Amino acid sequence: ASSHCLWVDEFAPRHYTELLSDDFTNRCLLKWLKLWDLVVFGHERPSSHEQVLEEMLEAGLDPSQRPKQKVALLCGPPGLGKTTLAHVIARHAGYSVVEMNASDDRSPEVFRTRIEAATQMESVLGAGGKPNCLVIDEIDGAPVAAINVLLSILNRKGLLMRPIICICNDQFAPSLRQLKQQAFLLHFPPTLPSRLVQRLQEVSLRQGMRADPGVLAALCEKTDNDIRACINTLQFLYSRGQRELSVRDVQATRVGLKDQRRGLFSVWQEVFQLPRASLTSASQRFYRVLHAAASAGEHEKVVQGLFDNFLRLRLRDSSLGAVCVALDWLAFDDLLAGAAHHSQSFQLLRYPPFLPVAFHVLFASSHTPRITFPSSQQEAQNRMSQ
Amino acid sequence: MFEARLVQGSILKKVLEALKDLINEACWDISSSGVNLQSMDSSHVSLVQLTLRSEGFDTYRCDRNLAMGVNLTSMSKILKCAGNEDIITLRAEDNADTLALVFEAPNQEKVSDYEMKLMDLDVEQLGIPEQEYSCVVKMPSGEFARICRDLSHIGDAVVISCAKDGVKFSASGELGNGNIKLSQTSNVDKEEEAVTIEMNEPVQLTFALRYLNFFTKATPLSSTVTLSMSADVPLVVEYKIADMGHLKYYLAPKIEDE
Amino acid sequence: MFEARLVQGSILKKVLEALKDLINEACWDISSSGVNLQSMDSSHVSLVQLTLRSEGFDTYRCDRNLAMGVNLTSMSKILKCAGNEDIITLRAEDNADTLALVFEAPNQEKVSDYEMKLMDLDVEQLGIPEQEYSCVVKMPSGEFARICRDLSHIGDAVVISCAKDGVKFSASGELGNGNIKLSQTSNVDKEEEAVTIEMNEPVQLTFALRYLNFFTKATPLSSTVTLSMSADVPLVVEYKIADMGHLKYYLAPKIEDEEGS
Amino acid sequence: MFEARLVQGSILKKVLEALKDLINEACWDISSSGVNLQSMDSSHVSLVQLTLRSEGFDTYRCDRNLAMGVNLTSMSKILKCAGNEDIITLRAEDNADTLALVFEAPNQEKVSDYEMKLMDLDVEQLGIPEQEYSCVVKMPSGEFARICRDLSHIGDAVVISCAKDGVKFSASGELGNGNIKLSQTSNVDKEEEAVTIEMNEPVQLTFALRYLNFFTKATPLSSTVTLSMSADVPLVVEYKIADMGHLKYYLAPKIEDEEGS
Amino acid sequence: KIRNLPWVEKYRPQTLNDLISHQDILSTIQKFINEDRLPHLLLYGPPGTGKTSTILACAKQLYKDKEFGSMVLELNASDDRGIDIIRGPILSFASTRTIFKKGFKLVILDEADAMTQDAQNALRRVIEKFTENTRFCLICNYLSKIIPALQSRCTRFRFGPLTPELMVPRLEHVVEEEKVDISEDGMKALVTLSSGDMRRALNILQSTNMAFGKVTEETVYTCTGHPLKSDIANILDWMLNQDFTTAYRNITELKTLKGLALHDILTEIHLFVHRVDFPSSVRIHLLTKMADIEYRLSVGTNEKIQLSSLIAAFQVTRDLIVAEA
Amino acid sequence: HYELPWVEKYRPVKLNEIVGNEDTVSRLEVFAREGNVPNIIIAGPPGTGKTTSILCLARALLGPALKDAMLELNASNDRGIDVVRNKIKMFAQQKVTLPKGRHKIIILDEADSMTDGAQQALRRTMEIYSKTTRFALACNASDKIIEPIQSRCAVLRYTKLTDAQILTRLMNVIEKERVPYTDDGLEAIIFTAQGDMRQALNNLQSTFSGFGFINSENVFKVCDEPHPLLVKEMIQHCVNANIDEAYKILAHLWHLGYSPEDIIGNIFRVCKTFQMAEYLKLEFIKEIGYTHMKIAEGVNSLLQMAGLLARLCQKTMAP
DNA sequence: GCAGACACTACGAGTACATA
DNA sequence: TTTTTTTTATGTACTCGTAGTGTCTGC
Ligand SMILES: Nc1ncnc2c1ncn2[C@@H]1O[C@H](COP(=O)(O)OP(=O)(O)OP(O)(O)=S)[C@@H](O)[C@H]1O
Ligand SMILES: Nc1ncnc2c1ncn2[C@@H]1O[C@H](COP(=O)(O)OP(=O)(O)OP(O)(O)=S)[C@@H](O)[C@H]1O
Ligand SMILES: Nc1ncnc2c1ncn2[C@@H]1O[C@H](COP(=O)(O)OP(=O)(O)OP(O)(O)=S)[C@@H](O)[C@H]1O
Ligand SMILES: [Mg+2]
Ligand SMILES: [Mg+2]
Ligand SMILES: [Mg+2]
Numbered sequence A: 001a002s003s004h005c006l007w008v009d010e011f012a013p014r015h016y017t018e019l020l021s022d023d024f025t026n027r028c029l030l031k032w033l034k035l036w037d038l039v040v041f042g043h044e045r046p047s048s049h050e051q052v053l054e055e056m057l058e059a060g061l062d063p064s065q066r067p068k069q070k071v072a073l074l075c076g077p078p079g080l081g082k083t084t085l086a087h088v089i090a091r092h093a094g095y096s097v098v099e100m101n102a103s104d105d106r107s108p109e110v111f112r113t114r115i116e117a118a119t120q121m122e123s124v125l126g127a128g129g130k131p132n133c134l135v136i137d138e139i140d141g142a143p144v145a146a147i148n149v150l151l152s153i154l155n156r157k158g159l160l161m162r163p164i165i166c167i168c169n170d171q172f173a174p175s176l177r178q179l180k181q182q183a184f185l186l187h188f189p190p191t192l193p194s195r196l197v198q199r200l201q202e203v204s205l206r207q208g209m210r211a212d213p214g215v216l217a218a219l220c221e222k223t224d225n226d227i228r229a230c231i232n233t234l235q236f237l238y239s240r241g242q243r244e245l246s247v248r249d250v251q252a253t254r255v256g257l258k259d260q261r262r263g264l265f266s267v268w269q270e271v272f273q274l275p276r277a278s279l280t281s282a283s284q285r286f287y288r289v290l291h292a293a294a295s296a297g298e299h300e301k302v303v304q305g306l307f308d309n310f311l312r313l314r315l316r317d318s319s320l321g322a323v324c325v326a327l328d329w330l331a332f333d334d335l336l337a338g339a340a341h342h343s344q345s346f347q348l349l350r351y352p353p354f355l356p357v358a359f360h361v362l363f364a365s366s367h368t369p370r371i372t373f374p375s376s377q378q379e380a381q382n383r384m385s386q
Numbered sequence B: 001m002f003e004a005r006l007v008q009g010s011i012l013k014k015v016l017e018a019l020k021d022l023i024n025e026a027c028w029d030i031s032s033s034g035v036n037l038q039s040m041d042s043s044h045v046s047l048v049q050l051t052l053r054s055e056g057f058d059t060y061r062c063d064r065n066l067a068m069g070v071n072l073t074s075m076s077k078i079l080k081c082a083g084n085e086d087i088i089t090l091r092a093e094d095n096a097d098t099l100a101l102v103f104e105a106p107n108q109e110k111v112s113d114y115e116m117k118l119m120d121l122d123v124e125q126l127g128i129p130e131q132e133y134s135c136v137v138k139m140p141s142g143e144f145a146r147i148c149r150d151l152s153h154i155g156d157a158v159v160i161s162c163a164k165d166g167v168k169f170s171a172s173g174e175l176g177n178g179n180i181k182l183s184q185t186s187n188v189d190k191e192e193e194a195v196t197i198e199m200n201e202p203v204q205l206t207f208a209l210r211y212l213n214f215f216t217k218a219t220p221l222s223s224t225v226t227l228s229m230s231a232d233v234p235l236v237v238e239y240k241i242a243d244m245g246h247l248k249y250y251l252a253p254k255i256e257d258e
Numbered sequence C, D: 001m002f003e004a005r006l007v008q009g010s011i012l013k014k015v016l017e018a019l020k021d022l023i024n025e026a027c028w029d030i031s032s033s034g035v036n037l038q039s040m041d042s043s044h045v046s047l048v049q050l051t052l053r054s055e056g057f058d059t060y061r062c063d064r065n066l067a068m069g070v071n072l073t074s075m076s077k078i079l080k081c082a083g084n085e086d087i088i089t090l091r092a093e094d095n096a097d098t099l100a101l102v103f104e105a106p107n108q109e110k111v112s113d114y115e116m117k118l119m120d121l122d123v124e125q126l127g128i129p130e131q132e133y134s135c136v137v138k139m140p141s142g143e144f145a146r147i148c149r150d151l152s153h154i155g156d157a158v159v160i161s162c163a164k165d166g167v168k169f170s171a172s173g174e175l176g177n178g179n180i181k182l183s184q185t186s187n188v189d190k191e192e193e194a195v196t197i198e199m200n201e202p203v204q205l206t207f208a209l210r211y212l213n214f215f216t217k218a219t220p221l222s223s224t225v226t227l228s229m230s231a232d233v234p235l236v237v238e239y240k241i242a243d244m245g246h247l248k249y250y251l252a253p254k255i256e257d258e259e260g261s
Numbered sequence E: 001k002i003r004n005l006p007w008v009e010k011y012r013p014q015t016l017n018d019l020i021s022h023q024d025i026l027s028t029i030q031k032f033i034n035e036d037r038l039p040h041l042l043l044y045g046p047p048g049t050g051k052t053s054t055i056l057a058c059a060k061q062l063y064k065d066k067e068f069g070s071m072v073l074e075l076n077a078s079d080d081r082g083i084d085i086i087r088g089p090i091l092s093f094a095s096t097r098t099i100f101k102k103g104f105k106l107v108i109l110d111e112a113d114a115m116t117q118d119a120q121n122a123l124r125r126v127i128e129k130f131t132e133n134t135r136f137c138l139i140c141n142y143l144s145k146i147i148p149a150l151q152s153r154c155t156r157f158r159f160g161p162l163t164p165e166l167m168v169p170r171l172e173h174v175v176e177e178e179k180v181d182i183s184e185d186g187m188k189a190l191v192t193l194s195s196g197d198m199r200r201a202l203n204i205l206q207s208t209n210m211a212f213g214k215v216t217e218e219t220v221y222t223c224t225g226h227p228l229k230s231d232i233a234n235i236l237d238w239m240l241n242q243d244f245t246t247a248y249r250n251i252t253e254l255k256t257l258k259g260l261a262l263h264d265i266l267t268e269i270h271l272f273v274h275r276v277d278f279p280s281s282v283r284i285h286l287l288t289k290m291a292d293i294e295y296r297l298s299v300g301t302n303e304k305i306q307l308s309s310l311i312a313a314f315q316v317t318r319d320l321i322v323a324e325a
Numbered sequence F: 001h002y003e004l005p006w007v008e009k010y011r012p013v014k015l016n017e018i019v020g021n022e023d024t025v026s027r028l029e030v031f032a033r034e035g036n037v038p039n040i041i042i043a044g045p046p047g048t049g050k051t052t053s054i055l056c057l058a059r060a061l062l063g064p065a066l067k068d069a070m071l072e073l074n075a076s077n078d079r080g081i082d083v084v085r086n087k088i089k090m091f092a093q094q095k096v097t098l099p100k101g102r103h104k105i106i107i108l109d110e111a112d113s114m115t116d117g118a119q120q121a122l123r124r125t126m127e128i129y130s131k132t133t134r135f136a137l138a139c140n141a142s143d144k145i146i147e148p149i150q151s152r153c154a155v156l157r158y159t160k161l162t163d164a165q166i167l168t169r170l171m172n173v174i175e176k177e178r179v180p181y182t183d184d185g186l187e188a189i190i191f192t193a194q195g196d197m198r199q200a201l202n203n204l205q206s207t208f209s210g211f212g213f214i215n216s217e218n219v220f221k222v223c224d225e226p227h228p229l230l231v232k233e234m235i236q237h238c239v240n241a242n243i244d245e246a247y248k249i250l251a252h253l254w255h256l257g258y259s260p261e262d263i264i265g266n267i268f269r270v271c272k273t274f275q276m277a278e279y280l281k282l283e284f285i286k287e288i289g290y291t292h293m294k295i296a297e298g299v300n301s302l303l304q305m306a307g308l309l310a311r312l313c314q315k316t317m318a319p
Numbered sequence G: 001g002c003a004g005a006c007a008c009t010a011c012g013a014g015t016a017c018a019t020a
Numbered sequence H: 001t002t003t004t005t006t007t008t009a010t011g012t013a014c015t016c017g018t019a020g021t022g023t024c025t026g027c
Helices: A023-034 A048-057 A082-092 A108-119 A146-152 A193-206 A211-222 A229-240 A249-250 A264-271 A281-298 A299-309 A321-343 A346-350 A353-360 A377-386 B009-018 B073-075 B141-154 B208-217 C010-018 C075-081 C141-152 C209-218 D074-079 D140-155 D208-218 E024-033 E052-062 E083-095 E117-131 E148-153 E164-178 E184-194 E197-213 E217-224 E229-241 E244-258 E262-273 E281-296 E305-322 F022-034 F048-063 F081-093 F114-129 F148-153 F161-177 F185-192 F197-210 F216-222 F225-238 F241-254 F258-274 F278-297 F301-314
Strands: A071-075 A096-099 A133-135 A164-167 B004-006 B025-030 B036-041 B045-055 B055-062 B068-070 B089-092 B100-102 B110-117 B134-142 B159-160 B168-172 B177-180 B204-208 B222-231 B233-239 B246-250 C002-006 C025-030 C035-039 C046-053 C066-071 C086-091 C096-105 C111-117 C135-140 C157-162 C166-171 C177-182 C204-206 C224-229 C233-239 C245-251 D002-005 D024-028 D036-042 D046-053 D059-062 D067-071 D089-092 D098-104 D111-117 D135-140 D157-162 D166-170 D178-181 D203-208 D225-229 D235-239 D245-251 E041-044 E072-075 E104-108 E132-142 E155-158 F040-041 F070-073 F106-107 F133-139 F154-157
Touching: A023 A048, A023 A071, A023 A082, A023 E184, A071 A082, A082 A096, A082 A133, A096 E104, A108 A133, A108 A146, A133 F301, A193 A211, A193 A229, A193 C204, A211 A229, A211 A249, A229 C086, A229 F148, A229 F154, A264 A281, A264 A299, A281 F278, A299 A321, A299 A353, A299 A377, A321 A346, A321 A353, A321 F278, A346 F258, A346 F278, A377 E083, B004 B009, B009 B068, B009 B073, B025 B208, B036 D111, B045 B208, B045 C157, B045 C166, B100 C166, B100 F161, B110 E155, B134 D059, B141 B168, B141 B208, B141 B222, B141 E024, B159 B208, B204 B208, B208 B246, B246 F241, C010 C075, C010 C209, C046 C209, C066 C075, C066 C111, C075 C096, C075 C111, C075 D067, C135 C141, C141 C166, C141 C177, C141 C209, C141 C224, C157 C209, C157 C224, C204 C209, C209 C233, C209 F022, C209 F185, D046 D208, D067 D111, D067 F278, D135 D140, D140 D166, D140 D178, D140 D208, D140 D225, D157 D225, D157 F225, D203 D208, D208 D245, E024 E155, E024 F197, E041 E052, E052 E104, E052 E132, E083 E104, E083 E117, E117 E132, E117 E148, E148 F197, E155 F197, E164 E184, E164 E197, E184 E217, E184 E229, E184 F216, E197 E217, E229 E244, E229 E262, E244 E305, E262 E281, E281 F241, E281 F301, E305 F278, F022 F048, F048 F106, F048 F133, F081 F114, F148 F185, F161 F185, F161 F197, F185 F197, F185 F216, F197 F216, F225 F241, F241 F258, F241 F301, F258 F278, F258 F301, F278 F301
Parallel strands: A071 A164, A096 A133, A133 A164, E041 E132, E041 E155, E072 E104, E104 E132, F040 F133, F040 F154, F070 F106, F106 F133
Antiparallel strands: B004 B055, B004 B089, B025 B036, B025 B068, B036 B045, B045 B246, B089 B100, B100 B110, B110 C177, B134 B222, B159 B168, B159 B204, B168 B177, B222 B233, B233 B246, C002 C086, C025 C035, C025 C066, C035 C046, C046 C245, C086 C096, C096 C111, C111 D178, C135 C224, C157 C166, C157 C204, C166 C177, C224 C233, C233 C245, D002 D059, D002 D089, D024 D036, D024 D067, D036 D046, D046 D245, D089 D098, D098 D111, D135 D225, D157 D166, D157 D203, D166 D178, D225 D235, D235 D245
8 A cells, every 4th residue: 555645654653663753752751651550550560841851750649649740731843743652652551542633523511521431431342451541632722611621620539540641732822821730741842853864764765766865954954844744745756757856856945845833932033133154145134034023923922022122132222223213113013003903904014014124123133132021011001900 | 235125214213313422433244144333432432233134124135245334423314304114225335435225204105315425434343242241130121211311310420230139220419319229020011121130249330321321212122121231341231122133232331430 | 555455464474484584675566466576586596476366365455556665674573573363454655655564463452553664676677488397296385395404404406307207306415415206196185295297308407405495485375386397497486375376486507517527 | 777578579579670770779768658769870861769668568667767778780699599489588777787688598498698788879869740640541561561572673762642542652763663552442351451541631752762671671560550641741650569569660751853944 | 757866877878888988998898798708807997987887888788677687796885795695695696597598697796895805715716616607897996905816817907097088078968968058168177177087077067057057167166166276376486486474474365265275275286396397305395294284184283384384395495496596 | 608718718627738837737747647646735826727736636636536536615615613524524534436546635725715723623634534535725825824734735836927838828829719919919918917827818818809919009908017017116216216207107107097005005015025225125114104004094195195205215315 | 282302593702803 | 942911993704602493202
């Protein structure tokens, strides 16, 4: 069935030794799932960001013979292997994977009865049946009442006897904010380029296509360390007309270039800090900053971060002219928002995307600014409401 | 070429209403012996084993063994329009993507032909559930449905305890405690209401109410139901139909015993 | 002076509940022969031709011919609070805007005079061809409503065919197909439940289920409906009211293209 | 000391629902004759009087002429927790700043006490003239509620006319006029259905619809209703609630248009 | 018979031969109709140029009166045109055939710039899929409010402003049909104050004929309230030739005597400063100051202070122009 | 029968009749000949041939099973959260017998109109049933499609068609339709097309129906010259503080009947990608937004656009 | 003949967003 | 290597929860 399936499914890992994630996260998830071995399998013996995880793996158990963090929340950018890690780690620890993803109904009653089905009963095969590990994929799109249902099931003192592992893409969702305080938080770093280059070499040599490690490194750079996007791009670009991959096919924007939603701190860093030493022209930096600030989204938070961070830099303008024209640009955005929300004319909403890039023309430095998250406007509004 | 002429649509209606909210798919296995359906939930909570032999149909033609993976709701949509007492021709080809059902449901010579598209369901294999049950009792189906509804009125789960005496049902809630004690009811004229006990080694388990109600929704399918339960083996209810086959429901107990 | 008198209020309630989600506004054409209403739907796909005879009313007078365009949601709200056993008087003057509906309460004590304001729509008259149809089928209205409701669960567009054998309905949907074929059901004790075939040439045409389900709401008006079909003229649903008049529904076929292959 | 007992709990459970969205507070005046409530609405249009005599209570203790002021946003939630056929006791001390309502739980196993803070409101009695009205009529209560509800779908304001023929309700809107009349209903078995006329001078006044619907929210308290009108006096809607007392509603008319020449 | 109608509705070009200006576009659309090759049309332009009249004349030419209600679906901004309407009545009208007689149907979407972009995105495959069965005509004034996917699917005709040379014979036809005594200066004033818009030409003609009984230059400029060219030339000469006080007194007396408004004075002075050979630094300052004054007149501001600022904007540049030499 | 317009009559039915984007179209030809095509999202300008390429690929892959092995959904369909859960997933689960290397194809045309939740529900039914069904999405704005869907598909990006690529298809249509022409008329059709094959075919059909001959005068009598190439000269004049020529271009655009909103939109679109100083570009964009607020308020005259041009000329001579 | 239960659509309500 | 919240004023669109209500089953 070589001509029947995708290369992302033909080269999917079927064992723990074939995973492409960070080894620390794999070991932490496996140790967290083996902390359930006493309650689930009835056996005493199973066979910085790192420091908190290693402490919570060695923190012990509650007197109900369970981990005190009963939910493992998995976070990261798309295409890293989070679903693959959850399924491989669950099938490796003797469990049976029960999936509940975003393609289901996700109403607070259907979510409730599906969790009660998945976790509150034993196997219908009797003895020898594998336990159920409830994998909840795409929890960041669930409503807040579904998260409340999940937490009420998690905090019944009706006792939860089976592990639950949740997978999300953005950990800072407003529906998961109570979950992060209660979950074994595993954040996925981007995959190592050398490991992905070696894996793409293995895939291309299995498919009989020749490629240098340089063009595969360029493809990994293009797709922002996405395994699935790189393998799909190789599957399209190889075909069977030609054998050897060319560097200009990867360098071209026709195949393999997808839109990446930028983080807020990455956008503030690329606005305030110049790139380190082509790309040295000011026009390319102008267009790059404009497109990154447009592709991030959440425009009001970007404006608040610019307003709260631009006076904390090592500003070279001692005459305060750059600060004055930046405040003029901020007042320009505010007037545009007011006029668009007053006259119902939202074609005025194409100019405030040029507010961040103006800051990039004003306060771009070669230093390393410590960008903080904006809180002053929201704290002031809450205090004014009080 | 597969043809099965079910003599009455009542049994098909009661089966597809019994497992309407129970299983998400129907996997009909077609052989020369009859039609088999061994389906399991995705969370491994309930199991359905339905067998309809070839003698229970008006006709039965089966050239090759077939696997009909079909949607539950798409067939409930069909037999919401079927007839209670009418002949139902369930037919399919050897290598086809469709499954046809021909009937004359309103008794008004209204020739209805309803087709379905198959589901491509992965071939999971469940060979034989082991049957070495210590406690085998017999009960009427209607009284079981009534007591399951009475438990559903109060609680959310049933504590079921077998005994040489009979089967005790318990349920607890904030409103109150619902409890009955089954007695020997063999001194009646009806043979369906007689409770026959062939048990040893009494077992007390806890089961979900919703799956028990879905199992006992098949009360008019058979007059008498058989209960088979033991320690660490899931509970079986069994409806023996009169001439077509039999139906087995398997329910896994709760982890929190008592 | 226009003054019609519906002998009971149930027929007007059934008519205005059949057309409520279909007809935008009611154009009552008034003459000495009776009351005519030829109105298209909001989508300009269906057509409604209602003809009420002068002999069906209690008292009917009409000096000069009128053409009253009135709103339908207002008339629906008027006819909602109307009885099924009481006389309803429709009044209209020569050069006024008040179309008066005069009836009694369900308590049967107090009068109720509900005026409506006439509209100015001056729409051009649509010509009914009144030609012969290649298929005429007499069938009960309840069976037609039941088969349209059963075909609405499978698909959205229904291929209806008619031949020498009988009328056939097909709904190729997402679950699958539903093919219901009924013929020669005249061998019952009732007279309304019968399927009769009058004309010759077989026709297969596809129609929307929403408009057919809207047309089936005239089931309490007539026990037996007539279906007229041909390859060029549209589908006609003809309800023959017992002693008041008749109602014709015209539905255009959908555009279907075969596969190039 | 104020200490009163009711004979039926449905009196409060039918009289506070009309005052739920009509008036913002309930001011009770305590005297030896009974309890008197005179409350004007926030828009200065409606005026509610409620006089329940001391002969209708199960017991009644009143030493000093006191006035209590309670809110509606808490009493409406408290009243829904109470029963229907139980007994309600109202208690108020001489110097305390709370009003206690003691009744039976709907489970009929425990006694429920609810306390409400006394709002110290500074009002003055407006003073009804109690003059001779130019029109007095008697109507059924539920029929008047159905009449006020049927004009809600037509216009935002109603017109009440009262000649010697009877009482005419009109509702002129963008849809069309809705006119209903009631006259000479003395030939019925029920005494509460007697639509009668009592005065001579005809009156035609335009009133609001929302306030009349709020007035007809208190219909099953009494059997009949009374309507009093004059040329400039506001509309008086009188309910004779059983034996303990009566209720009066005052509704001001609208400003008439400039139809002069 | 006679009717009580406005002259922009009493005189509507029911046929394509009665429209005056866009002769190549109308010839192409007439050859579209005659060859039975009518595409999806996109008529865009300034108001009062005859786009709705064009599509109504085409609909009356294509279809008879006995079948017009079954072939044409006309929707405008007064109707609900949400995405439920595109998926509902419009899609059912497109996907079904006719009732009485065979033919292709016509969906007219007047004022299509007022449609939401969800409805415009739902329109795309309705237009593309049922091209043989039904035709679509979008009419707009702003082309930027229609998505580029809908602009690709329709052939677009720009109905530009009506030139005053071709505007005269239609106005002469309306004048002869209404028994109006008009001079040549009155017709010149009509085609000047209309500015490529037959609606305002007919409205000003009807208003002047009702107010005065004759249509001359004085009657048109009195009924409209517009200042004459000599008044604007006098205002510019006073602003450029003498001091602040004398120019202020003369302009104030001219505005009080003739009842002029500052918006039209600003418009005509803006038209005049591009004709006067100013230096480029003077012209930029004058344009900026006059745009500021025109923006200040859009709210509750005293017109006397704005008139003084209009005088000030030229009293600043007088010395600069003279010292430039 | 009614003859289709040349956009719909001369829609390509094979993948080798599609001009432009030669490498991507050639790889789609290889995939249509062989099979086992990955999930695909085609993005690009309108009129490039994305729907044509997807439909031709689906037809060439499926053959006679196109009626039962393809699910085509548009923005004219519902395709909300309840349709991705119930209809798309049931089609992905549906058994369809196909030859080797061929899968079911769920064409989701114009995928920008789908909401975020429907695209979130699309992810797991894309990933699970990939051995039996495939996805072919077409879009204009690729940022409207979320990043999990773009990771689950091969993102092909179509570029705007060049002059020779449209000229080859125009020569094919002209030789099919026996249309007389000159080279200048075809150059004018290319000029009015602006990289759009739909507009090229529409303008060719309009000119041939109206006049019967394709020279520059007959094209420009019915079609129109493009806006931003003329706006760019005015912006270049405003950069050099030349107010007279900028007002000449502005008054020429005003007398053509263009509204102030279209003119200021073209001015902003030119000033986004203009070649000048970045701080001067930001000053220009801020002045354009300040004028556009006045346009949206209600004051939209020729004097306001002239004041905008004067302020843009002031921004040059104000360091 | 009349009470209990089933699904049906209409309607209330919360939320997001609107540009290139 | 750094995260909590409701304002902008309409119009539209989507999604979900709730409530009359027509009709079927049963003793
Ligand atoms: N070691 C590996 N070698 C090759 N392919 C792999 C490997 N690990 C994972 N993959 C594939 O790469 C993809 C990983 O993405 P998934 O784990 O399925 O989803 P995800 O990582 O959670 O990202 P999102 O947010 O769901 S898009 C899948 O298509 C896997 O089959
Ligand atoms: N070209 C024309 N020839 C003759 N009369 C015209 C012409 N254009 C406009 N008119 C007159 O102006 C009236 C209105 O013109 P319309 O056809 O409505 O123009 P329009 O382009 O639709 O304007 P908008 O954009 O809808 S406000 C017509 O009824 C005619 O009386
Ligand atoms: N590359 C091309 N080669 C040949 N004809 C083309 C090409 N692109 C477009 N066309 C023609 O233009 C018509 C429209 O093409 P489509 O593929 O529907 O446009 P599109 O690429 O989908 O752009 P949008 O975003 O859907 S408006 C086709 O029917 C062809 O007649
Ligand atoms: Mg995943
Ligand atoms: Mg118009
Ligand atoms: Mg397309």
